[PDB]
Write a protein that holds these residues in place. Structure first.
Motif, PDB file in Angstrom:
ATOM      1  N   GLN A  34     -14.299 -61.824  45.422  1.00  0.00           N
ATOM      2  CA  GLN A  34     -14.305 -60.469  44.890  1.00  0.00           C
ATOM      3  C   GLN A  34     -15.709 -59.872  44.968  1.00  0.00           C
ATOM      4  OE1 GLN A  34     -13.219 -60.131  40.752  1.00  0.00           O
ATOM      5  NE2 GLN A  34     -12.670 -57.963  40.966  1.00  0.00           N
ATOM      6  N   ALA A  37     -16.684 -59.254  48.696  1.00  0.00           N
ATOM      7  CA  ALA A  37     -15.952 -58.078  49.150  1.00  0.00           C
ATOM      8  C   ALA A  37     -16.663 -56.821  48.668  1.00  0.00           C
ATOM      9  CB  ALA A  37     -14.524 -58.107  48.635  1.00  0.00           C
ATOM     10  N   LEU A  41     -18.059 -53.920  50.990  1.00  0.00           N
ATOM     11  CA  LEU A  41     -17.574 -52.570  50.737  1.00  0.00           C
ATOM     12  C   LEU A  41     -18.755 -51.637  50.525  1.00  0.00           C
ATOM     13  CD1 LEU A  41     -14.542 -53.127  48.340  1.00  0.00           C
ATOM     14  CD2 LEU A  41     -14.469 -52.245  50.682  1.00  0.00           C
ATOM     15  N   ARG A  44     -20.520 -50.730  53.579  1.00  0.00           N
ATOM     16  CA  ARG A  44     -19.780 -49.742  54.361  1.00  0.00           C
ATOM     17  C   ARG A  44     -19.645 -48.418  53.612  1.00  0.00           C
ATOM     18  NH1 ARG A  44     -14.878 -53.204  57.369  1.00  0.00           N
ATOM     19  NH2 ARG A  44     -16.039 -55.180  57.488  1.00  0.00           N
ATOM     20  N   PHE A  79      -9.483 -45.228  47.169  1.00  0.00           N
ATOM     21  CA  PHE A  79      -8.570 -46.332  47.439  1.00  0.00           C
ATOM     22  C   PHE A  79      -7.582 -46.536  46.295  1.00  0.00           C
ATOM     23  CE2 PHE A  79      -7.305 -50.831  47.434  1.00  0.00           C
ATOM     24  CZ  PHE A  79      -6.678 -50.875  48.666  1.00  0.00           C
ATOM     25  N   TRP A  84      -1.666 -49.431  48.023  1.00  0.00           N
ATOM     26  CA  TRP A  84      -2.394 -49.991  49.156  1.00  0.00           C
ATOM     27  C   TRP A  84      -2.635 -48.944  50.237  1.00  0.00           C
ATOM     28  CZ3 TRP A  84      -4.792 -53.998  47.777  1.00  0.00           C
ATOM     29  CH2 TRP A  84      -5.428 -54.834  48.707  1.00  0.00           C
TER      30      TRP A  84
ATOM     31  N   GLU B   9     -11.226 -53.209  56.895  1.00  0.00           N
ATOM     32  CA  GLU B   9     -11.365 -52.659  55.557  1.00  0.00           C
ATOM     33  C   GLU B   9     -10.264 -53.209  54.657  1.00  0.00           C
ATOM     34  OE1 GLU B   9     -11.252 -48.299  55.161  1.00  0.00           O
ATOM     35  OE2 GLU B   9     -13.449 -48.378  55.319  1.00  0.00           O
ATOM     36  N   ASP B  10      -9.055 -53.290  55.202  1.00  0.00           N
ATOM     37  CA  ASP B  10      -7.894 -53.729  54.439  1.00  0.00           C
ATOM     38  C   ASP B  10      -8.087 -55.139  53.891  1.00  0.00           C
ATOM     39  OD1 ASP B  10      -7.454 -54.401  57.425  1.00  0.00           O
ATOM     40  OD2 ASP B  10      -5.978 -55.681  56.419  1.00  0.00           O
ATOM     41  N   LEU B  12     -10.976 -56.466  53.086  1.00  0.00           N
ATOM     42  CA  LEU B  12     -11.961 -56.383  52.021  1.00  0.00           C
ATOM     43  C   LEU B  12     -11.266 -56.083  50.700  1.00  0.00           C
ATOM     44  CD1 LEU B  12     -14.810 -54.367  53.778  1.00  0.00           C
ATOM     45  CD2 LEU B  12     -14.583 -56.840  53.511  1.00  0.00           C
ATOM     46  N   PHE B  13     -10.420 -55.060  50.702  1.00  0.00           N
ATOM     47  CA  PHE B  13      -9.713 -54.670  49.492  1.00  0.00           C
ATOM     48  C   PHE B  13      -8.769 -55.775  49.053  1.00  0.00           C
ATOM     49  CE2 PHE B  13     -10.748 -50.283  50.979  1.00  0.00           C
ATOM     50  CZ  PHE B  13     -11.502 -49.928  49.880  1.00  0.00           C
ATOM     51  N   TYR B  14      -8.234 -56.512  50.022  1.00  0.00           N
ATOM     52  CA  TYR B  14      -7.389 -57.661  49.723  1.00  0.00           C
ATOM     53  C   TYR B  14      -8.187 -58.707  48.952  1.00  0.00           C
ATOM     54  CZ  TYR B  14      -4.709 -61.940  50.385  1.00  0.00           C
ATOM     55  OH  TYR B  14      -4.033 -63.121  50.183  1.00  0.00           O
ATOM     56  N   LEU B  15      -9.408 -58.962  49.408  1.00  0.00           N
ATOM     57  CA  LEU B  15     -10.281 -59.926  48.753  1.00  0.00           C
ATOM     58  C   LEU B  15     -10.705 -59.449  47.369  1.00  0.00           C
ATOM     59  CD1 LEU B  15     -12.567 -61.145  51.679  1.00  0.00           C
ATOM     60  CD2 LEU B  15     -10.590 -62.282  50.652  1.00  0.00           C
ATOM     61  N   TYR B  16     -10.833 -58.138  47.203  1.00  0.00           N
ATOM     62  CA  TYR B  16     -11.302 -57.590  45.939  1.00  0.00           C
ATOM     63  C   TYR B  16     -10.184 -57.489  44.901  1.00  0.00           C
ATOM     64  CZ  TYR B  16     -13.691 -54.665  42.546  1.00  0.00           C
ATOM     65  OH  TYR B  16     -14.251 -54.170  41.393  1.00  0.00           O
ATOM     66  N   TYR B  17      -9.000 -57.067  45.330  1.00  0.00           N
ATOM     67  CA  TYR B  17      -7.914 -56.792  44.396  1.00  0.00           C
ATOM     68  C   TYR B  17      -6.823 -57.856  44.377  1.00  0.00           C
ATOM     69  CZ  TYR B  17      -9.479 -52.016  43.394  1.00  0.00           C
ATOM     70  OH  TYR B  17     -10.185 -50.915  42.970  1.00  0.00           O
ATOM     71  N   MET B  18      -6.680 -58.601  45.468  1.00  0.00           N
ATOM     72  CA  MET B  18      -5.467 -59.385  45.688  1.00  0.00           C
ATOM     73  C   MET B  18      -5.737 -60.778  46.255  1.00  0.00           C
ATOM     74  SD  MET B  18      -2.331 -58.589  44.970  1.00  0.00           S
ATOM     75  CE  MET B  18      -2.707 -56.845  44.815  1.00  0.00           C
ATOM     76  N   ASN B  19      -6.837 -61.407  45.847  1.00  0.00           N
ATOM     77  CA  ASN B  19      -7.163 -62.736  46.363  1.00  0.00           C
ATOM     78  C   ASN B  19      -6.299 -63.835  45.745  1.00  0.00           C
ATOM     79  OD1 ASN B  19      -8.787 -63.950  43.974  1.00  0.00           O
ATOM     80  ND2 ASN B  19      -9.836 -62.007  44.365  1.00  0.00           N
TER      81      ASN B  19
END
Lengths: 103, 96
Positions: A34, A37, A41, A44, A79, A84, B9-10, B12-19
């Motif tokens: 987390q 990431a 993020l 970017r 986001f 999603w 990018e997808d 990254l958000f997976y790692l942040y929200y849904m790991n």
């Protein structure tokens, strides 16, 4: 659940030793991922808004209509983790409402 | 430490929200409990009987003896003599 979750946990972790169990209980993997990431993020050009509680970024190819030393107006992508997806919205962005670079 | 710059990018958000760490956390707890570990709420630590160590004192509400404690600060299993009150141990993990 119960005996079913017991079975799921057994299939997944049954063969491994106590050290993995603790590694997982204290979420050593998840917490770091987390973080990494977040760092990427941020690299970017994504900023985390504290109140809105979402990641946002300027829509590429669009400079802020109005800008100062404390805020700026313009179009940003937000986001939506629930669906999603990435959605654009004209927004009043106040710099002090953004988290600092992770780590 | 890792080079995430190459991925979508997808992801990254997976790692942040849904790991899924939270889910694995629950499964870990279930497994620990099923291997005879108990979690002491107040001491905030997982505990288990040291093999070959029978309790010194034993009553219907507590016991005293030597048990293994997992020290999450030093990340190692540590032996300690301790006054163990049963009702301070959490019940088998369940869904929140």
């Amino acid at each position: 659940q119960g005996p079913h979750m017991d079975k799921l946990a057994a299939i997944k972790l049954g063969r491994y030793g106590e050290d993995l169990l603790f590694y997982l209980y204290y979420m050593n993997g998840g917490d770091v991922l987390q973080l990494l990431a977040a760092v990427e993020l941020f690299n970017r050009d994504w900023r985390y808004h504290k109140e809105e509680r979402v990641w946002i970024t300027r829509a590429p190819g669009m400079e802020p209509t109005m800008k100062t030393n404390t805020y700026e107006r313009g179009t940003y992508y937000f986001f939506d983790c629930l669906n999603w997806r990435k959605v654009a919205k004209e927004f009043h962005l106040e710099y002090d409402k953004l988290e600092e670079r992770p780590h």
